[PDB]
Structure formats: structure tokens, C-alpha cells
Amino acid sequence: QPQELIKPNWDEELPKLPTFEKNFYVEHESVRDRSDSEIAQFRKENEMTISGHDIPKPITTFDEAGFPDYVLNEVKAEGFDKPTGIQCQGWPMALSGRDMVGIAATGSGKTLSYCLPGIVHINAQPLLAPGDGPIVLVLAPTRELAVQIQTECSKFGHSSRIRNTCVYGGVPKSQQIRDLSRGSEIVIATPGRLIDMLEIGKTNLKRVTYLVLDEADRMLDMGFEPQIRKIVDQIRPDRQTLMWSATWPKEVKQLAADYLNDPIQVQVGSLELSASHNITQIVEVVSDFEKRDRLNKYLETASQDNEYKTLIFASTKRMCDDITKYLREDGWPALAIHGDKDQRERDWVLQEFRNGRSPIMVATDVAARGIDVKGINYVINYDMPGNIEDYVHRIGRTGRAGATGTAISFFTEQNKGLGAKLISIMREANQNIPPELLKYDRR
Amino acid sequence: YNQPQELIKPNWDEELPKLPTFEKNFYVEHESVRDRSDSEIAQFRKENEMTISGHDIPKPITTFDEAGFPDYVLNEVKAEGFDKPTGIQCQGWPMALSGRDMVGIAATGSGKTLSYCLPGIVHINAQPLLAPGDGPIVLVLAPTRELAVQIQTECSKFGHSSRIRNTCVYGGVPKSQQIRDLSRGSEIVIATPGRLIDMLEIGKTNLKRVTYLVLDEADRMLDMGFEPQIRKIVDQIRPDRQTLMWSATWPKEVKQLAADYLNDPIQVQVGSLELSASHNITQIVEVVSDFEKRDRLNKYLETASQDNEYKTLIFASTKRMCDDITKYLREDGWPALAIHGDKDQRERDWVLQEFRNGRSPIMVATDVAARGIDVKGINYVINYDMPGNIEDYVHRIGRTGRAGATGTAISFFTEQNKGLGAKLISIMREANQNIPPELLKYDRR
Amino acid sequence: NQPQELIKPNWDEELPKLPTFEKNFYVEHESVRDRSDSEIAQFRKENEMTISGHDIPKPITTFDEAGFPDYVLNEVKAEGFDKPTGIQCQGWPMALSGRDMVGIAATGSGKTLSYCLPGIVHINAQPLLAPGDGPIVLVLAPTRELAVQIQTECSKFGHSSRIRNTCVYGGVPKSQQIRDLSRGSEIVIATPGRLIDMLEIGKTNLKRVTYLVLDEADRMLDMGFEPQIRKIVDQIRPDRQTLMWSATWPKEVKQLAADYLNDPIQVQVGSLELSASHNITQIVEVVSDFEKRDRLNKYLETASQDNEYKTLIFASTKRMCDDITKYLREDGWPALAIHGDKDQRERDWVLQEFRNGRSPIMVATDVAARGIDVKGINYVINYDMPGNIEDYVHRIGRTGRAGATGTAISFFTEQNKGLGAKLISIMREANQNIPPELLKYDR
Amino acid sequence: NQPQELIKPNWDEELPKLPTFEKNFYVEHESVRDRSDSEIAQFRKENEMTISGHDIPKPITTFDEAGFPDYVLNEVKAEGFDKPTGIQCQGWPMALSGRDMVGIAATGSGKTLSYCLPGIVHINAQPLLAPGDGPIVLVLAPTRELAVQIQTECSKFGHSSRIRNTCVYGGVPKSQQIRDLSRGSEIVIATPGRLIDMLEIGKTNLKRVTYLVLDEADRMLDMGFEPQIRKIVDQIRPDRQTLMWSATWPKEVKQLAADYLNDPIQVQVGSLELSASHNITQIVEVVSDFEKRDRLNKYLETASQDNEYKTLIFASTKRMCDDITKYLREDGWPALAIHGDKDQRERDWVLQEFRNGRSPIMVATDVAARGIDVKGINYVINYDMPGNIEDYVHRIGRTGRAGATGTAISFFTEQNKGLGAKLISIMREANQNIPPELLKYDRR
Ligand SMILES: Nc1ncnc2c1ncn2[C@@H]1O[C@H](COP(=O)(O)OP(=O)(O)O)[C@@H](O)[C@H]1O
Ligand SMILES: Nc1ncnc2c1ncn2[C@@H]1O[C@H](COP(=O)(O)OP(=O)(O)O)[C@@H](O)[C@H]1O
Ligand SMILES: Nc1ncnc2c1ncn2[C@@H]1O[C@H](COP(=O)(O)OP(=O)(O)O)[C@@H](O)[C@H]1O
Ligand SMILES: Nc1ncnc2c1ncn2[C@@H]1O[C@H](COP(=O)(O)OP(=O)(O)O)[C@@H](O)[C@H]1O
Ligand SMILES: [Mg+2]
Ligand SMILES: [Mg+2]
């Protein structure tokens, strides 16, 4: 805050900055030749379609990607195989130095599609020369989703000794300045918390050559574009930008044309959320004050069965700090999982929820990602997500074998933008729709 | 928070049947180890000069794939790029992964740290989840702040696959931030005995899940009077745990301690006091230095500054005195860079980059920080502090004068390390020694 | 610094430099004198009274028969109290007469206010406090949880006559405890440990103390408080009025009464016997402090099998009562707590949720659970053990009223050796079986 | 560096390795010799001199008569006083010649400037401080409030030849004591208690101390500081020049001189005694700590009845003098205070408001109320008592010079029993009535 705004004149300062390389792709032995026929059948096998110039070719296995061995032995240490559809096509795009757009399901590997090409980008550049800022900068919509990607970059950047900082709201900055002063090759920042440390000048965006935007759709819902364009005007314009999000409305396409240089977009996601038919959806029009009483009403209704197993969902981590701080004081056993928690800390909470030691657990969307806890009654959406991909995945946590379940959601008028497609999720699963939810179905 | 006290010493003869069950042995003698048979091993022992004395000691490994390590950890030594594991790790791993109490003595250029860190992770993953309010399962004890964090930097690089969390708790610093990391749970704790007891008295940790205890550098740790505090820490750990001792000096106190805390121990020694002792460096250690140390250093740098471009290497034993030495001379107008273990994980390679590029002729470093560097071309290596053994001294001075066949070594010796005066002349008198007018006191019997 | 820490005054020549005060304020009423010598004779015998002294007054029968002014009488009026306790029926006119007295009764019948109401009329008879003068009333309690309740009830009758009271006690920072003494206070309820300290640091003086109270004398002698008390009364004028109060009458309490009281008049009211009703199964486990949470989790899962259990965990202090309920909520258990320092009226919302099965588990202290007939209690768990057995009997006494069945699981440690002799003495009176591990601690 | 430290250094082997300083700078301007040998003899006991030594120099008459440079002499002129004190008339040639010397005089004599000015010329012969070097001049003082009096008194003659001076003393947070020592100072003012606490943390060093002074070594010896200075004087070069100063001549002060001074030379300037010129009604009251606030209030109602009363309260510490000042102000009594740390010139504005009767009550410390003519004051209450009986005689001495009447209310506690023995003989010689309760602390 105390003094800075000035935007630099990059027409004048680009000849003053050092030179960097962005293209690294290796076009490994196997891919060519196949050739140009079985890729087509493989492409739209896993929902791939191309629209761009000089398309690279998809990969099949990890070892066919031009990743070095210090990062390739970490995919092995993490036990994965068969990289995700976007990782099979997005990586040859990213290692070629191209600006690109990537949309896929939230739960797919959009994160590692830019995290791994960012490590090769860093290690090709000289040492950090203290007082130099980061080389990779990724901007995220919310505080605790920045930490999920920051726990995903620490999994593959120890080999290269890469230092990483995460800058986000809601916390004292006196700890993040002492992580930035030690140097950090990757910085994960929220636009609100990042600018006011560039205005006090404890970091620079002068070495940022590889910029990536995770979940740009969510980014637009908080009015953060006045804050991102202000700092993207503080970076060298010849960097490589990588867009990533889950949806494809008209507003992400507007943002792509303003920052990307000849962008290439990857589409893997696809409408046909099936809304597995064995879940009763009850959506209720409520307000800010009306909850915490409907929850007691639906918790004591769940309490009558034994042993019930309830899962409450929130979209922030401090709404889970609020809900849990309220159930426990009313006399309800409650456990929580959010992003600022540690996996092994979150894995003990997941273990105690399966053996039925406490029937209630509050969770966030990022924490409740790829979990199989069978036995779940009464999944409660105390909040509603920003998209219809998380809703189906939120309620998708009920009923595989027994083939029955209920999902209690608390809906309010500031969530109507998804109602129109929400009824079509209830309408395909042949669920009853309340007359007060038809208020959010027109045009 | 605040609480000042507790003391409890438990009666383990009565509390053992109430404790859960755990496994310590895991190692399975992979293909090429068996069998040879006992003809190949015979001189590979003295090829790697390792000395075993116990009963039913397992047989050494040669490959990484020959250790009973899973692939999720074996794919991490690959990402670190290591081949041909260290000699002591080639025999210490079959011993330690087999759940036996052991002591290992070798020079601090070996893999002593990872010879017990890697077997400790499989020990962790064989136990249930941490069940909050449970303390660590592995406890490693270190003498000082900056040795513990090197232990933490080798456990951090190998715990992502298993998501193992590790904390390091050490004295001389406000307690306010390590308590918030202990509460989130940590499977491995690396502690100095000085503060470790100081967190059991106000109670943010327990030693009741500790099944795999390690004592690193027990010789130097014993030299600072930490044993009266180690009595308190081992009296609160299950007596049936697995203890693994490691040190460099092989006294004359371990033999006592090893047989007071280890149950049926197995010792392996790889090092030997007989090698190198490089004669191509003029070693000039004569300065009493009690508190002169800064005054001679400017004068010994004023003589070094005359040549150009000189390249000087200052050595310290602690980080808090290694951030100091740079803090003392830079204010007199001397270009200095600092290198230690606590900070500067990636930063020390930039300082080493500016030491090769000739950007600053002076660099202060500690023994843990100056590990495996070939930055040679270094005149006038100064031991402003002195190490605990005669193998760190030789490696301190050993980084000068190989090709050009000349070098100098200035050390500052004082009564606070007189226990090593006897051993340095044994290398100095082989080294065509100087006159000890001030070591006179420190050679007899 | 806070030095020099004992100085004994010379009362023999500095007492003639201190102001004069009066101790006798009672004026016998029309219906009290006389009846006579038969109605007061029997009335002491139908209330188990036993007097011993010189010039013992006639006991009271109703509130207005006591020589109380009207501004304190209209306080018991608004409090809606019926037919004051026997110890109040005779304890009042003895205290109002300026006489040193001893009152023996069960912990809770009338003892606290037996000296508070006569202590207030003692206060309003003196000039204002002239800031930098200490208190007129000095109350000594052994523990923080007991000293708070004295202040919690002295603050209930000291607002008509504007009156301030303070608690000073160990384990807590003293900075705030001095900023209330900075305001001056007529009454102080003090722990010997923290009282000796603030006198050595010169943040209060005992020069205005003329009316001394020693509550829970049997506790203080069990905790080695006499050598600290002997130093406290070294700084009080010898013509003070000292009032002793206790629950038992061993040889060390009545030696302490003879050493400090001038012509004391004893009154014994209670029954002195602990019958330990036999329809509760008393299970005692000799454990240490690090097993207590594991076995609580295992005894709670045993109660969890019932439908529906209602357990009461017991702690002695506020700090662990906060620990226990902190730890249960993180283990997945529904937990409520009630203690004295906090929870004056919010304490009663907890009792209201615990009676109705809103929450099956409630943690409490011994003082906080005083006089609650919350029937429905199975499995009262003594996570702590008190210093005295009268509280144990009342702790376990909360299990089985009509159905006449219950369980009590106690956690016994080496630190509780002082009560083992009296713990088994009642466990065999109730003819419950004793496990061998606490036979070490008999006699 | 925060271990324990100050193990004795080996000076027979470490002294040849330090740079060198010379101590002799006195020039003995020419006509000081000769007079001679009888007109010096008349000079000696006009000022009550007592000399015992070898090769004794001759004393001074005027400021111009000393072998002082001009940069130091232009300030003795700037204060506007002539004719330095009898102890300054010989103490300067003793100290400026670099010989170990002890001077005894009353506390209030010119004992101070006999060491301040010869210490600065000793500095100016040496190079700049070369940060990380400790001080050259070290003087030891017994009390915080006496240590600040000399460092506020060193701030008068060391500005021109720029010399920085710091005061380090116990009972206060050390975080500001190290940050002025970080500035470096040729003169540092230290209490034995807080000096060892800065040598063990290694934020000052005693390697360059060449000019040691022991001011008021008598009172320092009574507080058990001797085992601590032998700890301190063994951490400094043995070839230094030491300067002792005190008012009393016990057997322990001279055995203290033979143990630390090398070939010491002795001078006294005063025919001792304090005979408590008698004009004050002394009412001693054997009291304890918790009643004194009410006891002073009753003595204030007794003074407040008079008009216009003017009372002076005395304390020994600054911190217990701010307590007294804003403790009766809570009782409704207007009080003003004077101490050594603070109130540089407002010490003088409160003094002007005290005589003209804008405020009748004033609390004071010992050093802050020394050498003031504030007469018109009755009712001086010694709420605290000093460590010796020489300050108290002056403390009560503020009551009655012309009018020939005065009162002195003293508060005595077993915290002051060390002074009870001689308190009675001063009251018995002033033939004041003696309370029965104070006779407890007199003999054996
Ligand atoms: N090929 C793969 N095999 C197994 N797990 C994977 C693979 N790719 C990613 N993951 C896991 O999925 C998660 C990554 O999800 P993320 O990419 O953040 O979702 P989004 O698509 O919203 O970015 C991480 O937990 C990662 O470990
Ligand atoms: N597989 C390996 N091959 C070769 N060197 C290794 C290997 N693993 C670790 N090292 C090196 O050996 C050292 C391991 O630390 P170590 O020397 O055991 O600490 P200490 O010996 O003081 O206990 C480090 O310097 C590290 O670079
Ligand atoms: N006359 C009365 N009528 C009804 N309740 C009373 C009366 N006197 C005291 N009480 C109750 O008894 C308690 C007073 O303290 P008490 O329990 O008597 O301590 P002790 O048991 O040590 O005497 C209060 O909780 C109050 O509600
Ligand atoms: N030559 C002088 N002329 C006038 N005043 C002096 C002279 N020397 C010292 N003083 C005064 O004496 C005080 C110095 O303290 P001092 O009284 O010497 O303490 P001590 O009694 O311990 O010697 C200063 O306040 C100063 O004003
Ligand atoms: Mg080691
Ligand atoms: Mg009571």
C-alpha cells in the first residue's frame, strides 16, 4: 500500500531483460509414426478435438513424454500410471512453449499439466540471484485452493530443490515475507493478497516467464480481473501463459483474447454428467439465517437411523471452521477436512468416518476429491458450488452397490445461475422438482 | 498457553502388556545378496574396510534394488540420481531394516544419515494413522540445531510418496512456532535433547508411539553434557523399541553407552584413522585465539588479500557463529558470503556459483554445509572454529592444494577443544609438523 | 523486581496507630428471646446441631429474625430463598455478634453465605477505602475452582450496598489480577500461593482486614497450606474476627482453631457420615495420565452401545475440564462442559441440553455440578479424582435414583494416594469388589 | 553468544599481543615549579591535604595551571566557574601522569572532575574505535542513580573532542543497553551487576580498557560487589591505570587498593567528619513497608494545616520516586519529582515552582537534590533511607539555615538496620529524643 502503482513500459524494457527459452518438447520415438489415423480414433475416443496451428501429438505413457528423469522418477514414486487425457495432449503443448487454454473436469489432472512443464522451465534458467522474484507465477481464485496446487508442486520439485511459496488471504503476511525473502522459484498467489506485497516491494514479477491461470472461470466471479490485469501489466509480455478452468462460458473466451498470444485450447470435459439415478435430490430455497436450524432438523432426522453417516459440504475452509464450531457446541459429533489440513491428518479423519466412529463430517470440494467412503446417508450441501460439476460430484458420493441415497441441498437466490441446469440434473435422474425451484428455470 | 512442570518416570515393567504391538524387522535379502557364498564377502568387507562383530548379522547389499526398499521410495533415490549406495548403507541397511539394535561408526562423509532415515519410513508406513494427540513414531536425537536440520532435510526429500510429516525441534529459539507444527501431527521428530525435555514438561508431545529411536553423533552429543538429559528421554520410551546409534569417533564412551541402552547390539565400523593426511598443505596452527580470533582473522586476511585473486574459505562449527563471522568481517569492509545447513537449501548453490565465478574471495561455511564440493583453487583455508574429530579437520583442509601442489591451513586452537590436541599432532607429526609451544599441555598420556 | 518477602510487623506498638472497629452487630429479636430452653434445645436436636463454647446465642428461625438491615434482606427476598439452612439459623447470630466461630457441615448446605451476609454489614460500618488500602474482608480458599464460587456468591449480595470482590490464585497471569486490585476491593477471596506473592510484590496490603474467613480448612491442611497461612495472619491485626469453616473435624483442624481463634464457639450441624449408596457399581482403574484418554474413548464406545446413554465425565479444575471436552470433540465425540470461572448463566443452557438428550456427554467440575438432580445418568466417569472423598461420593452419587442401578468408572493414579485409604473404605461399605492395584494405597 | 563466560585470561602470555597505550600526559607548566617546599606546605593543609607516596607531583592553583589541552579548557570556562576544587588541584597531576592514585573527599567535592578530564586526553592519544572494540575508559559505580549522575556529568566535557559515553546498569531491560553499546563508546558507565551480564553475551569487550576508575568504592564494598570486580579486573589488561575514589577510609578500602593498584599514591583533601549541624527536629519512626503511605498522609495533614507549608520528600531510587509521586496524587496531594535519568531542565522548572509556592510538595532523589539552595522548606520526610549516613545528614540538612527551626521525619525499616547503629549517635549528638524501638539495631 504505502507507495507503488507504476506500470512499466515494456516496449522500452524488453531489450533490457535477459533471454529465456520456453520450447522444450522432444517428440519422442514412439509417437511418430502411428500415424495421423489412429490418433484421430484415439483423439475422440477420449473426447479430444483440436483447433489451432501446428498441433503437437498426444502421448500415451509417461516415459513417452520429454520429461527428465528427476521428475519422471517422482511420478513413479507417487504410484500413478496412464497420465490423464489432458496430460497426454496438454504436456506436448506446454513443453513446446505455446500459450494454451485447458478445460477439463475438476478432479482430472489440469494441475499437473502445467506444474510439470514449469519445473523444466525453471531448471533451464540460472540460479535465483537473491533479490530476484519467482520464475513461475500461478494465480488462483480462493485462498485454500492455492494451497492444493502448492501441495501438488512440492510433490515434484524437491529433486530440483525448487523453493515454493503460497500467498493467500486471511493470514498474517509476516510469515510469507520471510518465505519470499529466502527466494522462491514458484509463487502461488491470490490476486488480492499478491498486489499489496508488490506495492510494498518485497517481491518482483521481473523474472516471471511462465504464467499459468488455474480456474479462471471462478476467478471472474469475484471481480478479480481489475486485480489480475494490474499485475499482468507488471510482467514481461513474451512469457508463456497457460489458462485452465472447468467451464467454457462466454466470459473465459473474452479473457483468452486479451492475454494469450495465438492460444491453443484443449477440450476434454463434456456435459453429460449423468446424476446417478439412485440419489433423491430435494433442493430447498432457503436464506442466510434459515440454516443452522434446517441442519438440526435434518441431522436429528438422520439421527433416528443407526448408524447413519452424514457428509456436509461447504465451499470455503472457514465455513467448515464455522459449521464444525457450531455442531460441536450443539452436541453433534463433527469432523472436518479442508485444504490447509495435512493429508495424513485428513486421512485419519477419513479412516474414522468409514468405521462409523462419528456419523458427521464436514468437507470442502478440494478435500473431498476422489474419496470412496461407502455407507453415506444424507449428503448435505450446506453451501452450493460455483459450478454444476462439483454438485454432481458432491452428491455423487452416495450409492454405488445398495443403489439408494438422499442429498439435501440448501439453495438461495445468489446461486440461481446454475438452477436452470440444476433442474435438468434432477430432470434426467427423474427426481421430483419443487414448484419453488421452477422460479429459476426460465431463459 | 502456559504450564511450567511435569516429571513422570513410568514403570515400564508394569505398562508393557497395555501397549500395542509393532514390527521392527523388514529386510528380505534380495536376489543377488544370496548366495556367493562367503568367499566374495570376505574381501569385500576389507575392500569397503567394514568390520562387523555380532551374531547372525545379515549380509551386505551392493545395489539399491538389493535393499528391501519398496518402489515408492526406490523411485525417489532414482530421482535423486544416486547409484552404488554408500559402504555403510550397504551393510547398515540389512541390519537396520532387520529390526536389530545397532551402532554404526564412520567418517561424516558416509551415508550415516540416510542409513537410518530410509529404514525409518517403512517402519512408519507399517503403523496405523497418527490418531491426533499421538506423538512421533521415529525419534532422532542430534547434538545441535544445525545437525538436526540436515537430518530434517534428508527426511523431507523422501517422505512425499508416503506423505510422511517430520518436525525438527531445537533450542535457542522461541517455542511459539514449533508447537503449532507438532500439533498438526508428525511421524518423525528430530530433536535436540536440550529442548526435547523442555516440551515434555509443558506437554505438546508424547513419546508413547516412539518405536524407532535414533541417536546421531552420540560422541559429540556426549561431549556437551547431554547424557543427564538423555536419561530422561529414554526413560519415557518403550524399552522394547529399536535403537540405532551412529557416530564418527568410536570412543571409549559408546562401548559403555551402547551396552547401557542397546539390547543385543550389532556394531559395524567402516572408517579407519589411517589414510591421506595430505602433506601438500602447509598447516600453521599456532594461534592461542581465546578471544583474539577476529583480530587475527583481519590480519590473516590482510596477508591473504595481497595476492589476487585470493580465494579464502572460513570454517565454523555452528550456524549461529557462521552467520556471525560474516556479520563480523563484512562490517570491517571485507566481502563475505555465508553457507550453513539451516537456511540456504537452494541458496547455497548460488553462493557456490559466486565462489567459482570469483565474485567474492571469502566464504564462511560450516562442516555440514561444506559437504561434497569441488570448488578447489582455494588458498588460505582458516579453521576459525575447530571440529570435534580429526576426520572433519582433514576434510576441512583437504579442499586445497592438489594440482598446483601447494596450500596453507590456518587453524585457531584453544582449550575448549583440547581433547583433540593429542590427535592433531599425530596427523601433524606425520605431516612434518610445526612447533606446538601452545599444545605442550595437550599431548601427554 | 518483587523482593524482601516476609516482614513481620510489631503489633504490640503499631496497633495503637490503626483505626478502631466494632465487630458485634446483632440485636436479638422479639420472637427469638425467649421461647425458651426447650424449643431451642429440641430445635438444635431436630437439625443435628452440636454447639460448644461460651455465651452461645439463640438460633434464628426465619430471615427477618436476624439482625440484618433491610437493604441486604431485600436481596435474599429477590433471590427467593426458603427457610435458611440450620447452619444459617445459628451461624448468623454468632457471626453477627463479633465472635470467632467454627462451622462444620457438609459442603453446600449453608456455609458460604453464613459469613458473606454478616461480612457485608461489617463492611458498610467502616469508612471508604481510600485507594491504596486493601480489603476489609479476606477469604482464604484452597483452590481456584473453590475461590471463584465464593466470589460468585459474594457478588450476588453486594450490589445494593455497592461492594467489590476479587479472586487471586495461581496458574494464571497476575497482570489482570492487579488491575482489579488497582480499583480497590472490600472483599478478596485468595489462594495462599498467589496471596503470599502479591504481598511480597506490594500490590495489596492486609491493614484493613478486620474480618477473616478460613473456608475449607480440611482441604488446606491436606495441601500443606498452614505454613503459608501462618505467614498471612502475621500481617493481620490480632483483634480481627476470624471465622473457620470446614466439612470434617479431624485433630489437625481443631488444633488449627485453637491456635488462631480467641474464645471460639463451635457449631456442628451435619451428619459426618458418607453412606455410599449401594446401587452403583464402583469400578476403579489404577492408571497413569497418558492412558486416560485412550480408555475414556474405550469406555465411551461401551456407553455408545446403549440407546441412549448419558455419561458425565468429571474433572477437578477448569483447565482440564476444558482439555477433556477439547479432546473429545477432536476424537469425534459430542461434548459439553461446565465450570466456574466462565459459564455463570450459559452454564444452565448446558444443563438444559444434557437433561433432554440433546447431547449424551457432559464434562464438569466438582463445583459446577453442585446440586443438580439431572436424573438419567449412567456411566459417570471420574476422569480425575478429587483431593477429598466427600466430593467423590457426591460425584458418583449422581447415578441411580428410581431404577436404582448405575456404573462409575474411576481413573486412579499415584498422585491420588492420599485418598485411597478412604476410597476403599467406602467401596467395601458399598460391598463393591476392589481390584488389587490400589491395595498399595490403603491406610 | 549467550553462554556463560569470563574464564580468567592468561595475561602473562596475552599481553604482548595487544597494541600499546601510554598513560603519562602531564606537562607541569613551568612556574608551578618552583615555589617551593614551604609555600606548597602552606597549600596542603589550607585544603586539608594528606599525602603518602613516592615522587609526588605538585598541585594546581587555577585551571590554566594544569597541563590540559585547549579543547578541554574552553568548557571549564563555558560553565563559568573558576578555581577548581582542592581535590582537583592535586588529583589532575596524579591522574594526568598515569600513576595509580586514590582520592578521598566528601561526596559533593570536586572528586568528579579529577577523573573525567584526564580520562579524555588519555582517549585522544589513541586511534578511532574500530567497531567491535570495547571502551578505553571504564568507571565502576555502585548504583543506577549514581551511574547516571556521572554519565550526565561526562556529557559536559566530551563533546568537543567527540567521545561517546554510555551508562549500563541493572534493573532495566538490556535491549536498549546493547544498542547504545553498538554505537561504540570510549567511556561506559557500569554497575558491577549489569557489566558481567554484558560480557557473557559478548556485546562488549574489556580488551582495550586502559583507564579504570572506582568511584565510591566504600559504598560499593558494603553491597558485596568486591567478588564481582575481581572478576572484572581480571578480564582487563594488567598494565592499566586505576583511579579509586571514596569518602570513607576503612581498613577494607586500603587493602582494596593494595590488591588492584600498582605502586599506589595516596591523597586526601578533607578533615573528615560530618557533624550534622543541628537545626532539625528528627522524629524517627520504626516502620515497615505497607503503612508509609498513610503515615505520610497524616504528616501531610499536619503540614497542610500550616500556611504556607513546603515539604520535601526524599527517595533513593528513581523507580520508587515515581511511585511516591503518583501515589499521593491519587490521595489528592500535588507532588512534583526530581531524578537523575530524566527531567534534564524540568528538574529546574519544578524547583522554581517549589519556592514560589505553586506546589507545596516535592519528591526528590539523593543525586537530583544535591547542592541546591531551596530554603524555606520545613517538613522533610525521608520516606527512604540512604545506604550510608553521609547522604542522610545532607538529606535532612535542607531544613533551617537562617530561621533556625525545622523538622525531619524518617521512616526506618529492617531493610535499613545496617544504618541504625550510627543513626542514634547522630541523634544522640544532636540530642534528639530516640524511640524505644530503634535501639534494637545498634550494637553487636
Ligand atoms: N495420471 C494420474 N494418475 C493418478 N492420479 C493423478 C493423475 N493425474 C493427477 N492425479 C491426481 O489428481 C489430483 C490432481 O487434480 P487437479 O489436477 O488439481 O484437478 P484439476 O483438474 O481441477 O486441476 C492430484 O491429487 C493428483 O495426485
Ligand atoms: N546414495 C548416495 N550415494 C552417494 N552419496 C550420498 C547418497 N545419499 C546421500 N549421500 C551423501 O552423503 C551424505 C549423507 O549425509 P551423511 O554424510 O550421512 O551425514 P552424517 O555422515 O554427518 O551423518 C550427504 O552429503 C549426501 O550428499
Ligand atoms: N437459604 C437458602 N435457600 C436456598 N438455597 C440456598 C440457601 N443458602 C444457600 N443456598 C444455596 O447453597 C449454595 C451456597 O453455598 P454452599 O453450597 O452452602 O457452600 P458450602 O456447601 O461450602 O456451604 C448456593 O448455591 C445457594 O444457591
Ligand atoms: N571547579 C568547579 N567549579 C564549580 N562547580 C564544580 C566544579 N567541579 C565540580 N563542580 C560541580 O560539582 C558537581 C560534580 O559532582 P561532585 O559534587 O563532584 O560529586 P562528588 O561529591 O562525588 O565529588 C557538578 O554538579 C558540578 O556542577
Ligand atoms: Mg552424522
Ligand atoms: Mg463453602
Residue numbers in the entry:
A (entry chain F): 54 to 496
B (entry chain C): 52 to 496
C (entry chain A): 53 to 495
D (entry chain B): 53 to 496
Sentences from the paper on this structure:
Human DDX5 and its yeast ortholog Dbp2 are ATP-dependent RNA helicases that play a key role in normal cell processes, cancer development, and viral infection. Similar to other DEAD-box proteins, DDX5/Dbp2 is composed of two RecA-like domains that include 11 conserved motifs. The helicase core of Dbp2 consists of two RecA-like domains (RecA1: aa 101–319; RecA2: aa 332–465), an NTE (aa 53–100), a CTE (aa 466–496), and a linker (aa 320–331). Here, we report the first X-ray crystal structures of the Dbp2 helicase core alone and in complex with ADP at 3.22 Å and 3.05 Å resolutions, respectively.
The Dbp2 catalytic core bound with ADP (Dbp2-ADP) crystallized in space group P212121 with six molecules (aa 53–496) in the asymmetric unit, arranged in a D3 hexamer. When Dbp2 bound to ADP, the two RecA-like domains underwent a large conformational change, distance between the centers of mass of the RecA1-RecA2 domains was reduced to 30.8 Å and the RecA2 domain rotated by 143.9°. Small-angle X-ray scattering (SAXS) analysis showed that Dbp2-ADP is monomeric in solution and the observed hexamer form is probably due to crystal packing. Although the conformation of the helicase core in the crystal structure of Dbp2-ADP was in a semi-closed state, it was in a completely open state in solution. In the crystal structure of Dbp2-ADP, residue Y221 of the RecA1 domain is close to residues G392 and D393 of the RecA2 domain; therefore, the spatial distance is in favor of an interdomain disulfide bridge formation between the RecA1 and RecA2 domains. Interestingly, the addition of ADP changes the conformation of the helicase core from an open state to a nearly closed state, which is different from the ADP-bound structures of DDX19 (35), DDX21 (36) and Prp5 (34).
